[PDB]
From Swiss-Prot, chain A:
It is found in: Mitochondrion inner membrane; Nucleus. Belongs to the complex I NDUFA13 subunit family. The chain crosses the membrane at residues 27-46. Accessory subunit of the mitochondrial membrane respiratory chain NADH dehydrogenase (Complex I), that is believed not to be involved in catalysis. Complex I functions in the transfer of electrons from NADH to the respiratory chain. The immediate electron acceptor for the enzyme is believed to be ubiquinone. Involved in the interferon/all-trans-retinoic acid (IFN/RA) induced cell death. This apoptotic activity is inhibited by interaction with viral IRF1. Prevents the transactivation of STAT3 target genes. This is NADH dehydrogenase [ubiquinone] 1 alpha subcomplex subunit 13. Complex I is composed of 45 different subunits. Interacts with CARD15, but not with CARD4. Interacts with STAT3, but not with STAT1, STAT2 and STAT5A. Interacts with OLFM4.
Curated annotation (Swiss-Prot), chain B:
Core subunit of the mitochondrial membrane respiratory chain NADH dehydrogenase (Complex I) which catalyzes electron transfer from NADH through the respiratory chain, using ubiquinone as an electron acceptor. Essential for the catalytic activity and assembly of complex I. It is found in: Mitochondrion inner membrane. Core subunit of respiratory chain NADH dehydrogenase (Complex I) which is composed of 45 different subunits. This is a component of the iron-sulfur (IP) fragment of the enzyme. Interacts with RAB5IF. This is NADH dehydrogenase [ubiquinone] iron-sulfur protein 8, mitochondrial. It comes from the Eukaryota. It comes from Bos taurus. Belongs to the complex I 23 kDa subunit family. The chain holds residues 37 to 95 of 212 of the full protein.
Length: 69, 59
């Protein structure tokens, strides 16, 4: 009996298949989150600066109140 | 046999133009390229230290 190297292909490994595809981001939907984070960013920040004004006037009031200084 | 490397204008009108502009305005594909190495970091490396482990050979 002769024994040589046997042939096997099975699945053929798929000859040239695309793996690159669009994922997560679509296009217009990313701008809704992108610019949406900006509008949420300013509104949250400016409310803190209005709360800073409560401290600001109260800080300068200490100088006016102190005349024996 | 012919396979063609040129895409021949991927952007046409409105919807196809904006997403091709979005990747150049910010990044997106660079963040997508960042994710390629990210998963590559977690998977176990095939490394052989010579004074203890030995590499594959043949008869």
């Amino acid at each position: 009996x002769x024994x040589x190297x046997x042939x096997x292909x099975x699945x053929x490994x798929x000859x040239x298949x695309x793996x690159x595809x669009x994922x997560x981001x679509x296009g217009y939907s990313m701008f809704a989150v992108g610019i949406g984070a900006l509008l949420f960013g300013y509104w949250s920040m400016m409310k803190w600066n209005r709360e800073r004004r409560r401290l600001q006037i109260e800080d300068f009031e200490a100088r006016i109140a102190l005349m024996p200084l | 046999t012919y396979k063609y490397v040129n895409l021949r204008e991927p952007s046409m009108d409105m919807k196809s133009v904006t997403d091709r502009a979005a990747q150049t305005l910010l990044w997106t594909e660079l963040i997508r390229g960042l994710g390629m190495t990210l998963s590559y970091l977690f998977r176990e490396p095939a490394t052989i230290n010579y004074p203890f482990e030995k590499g594959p050979l043949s008869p």
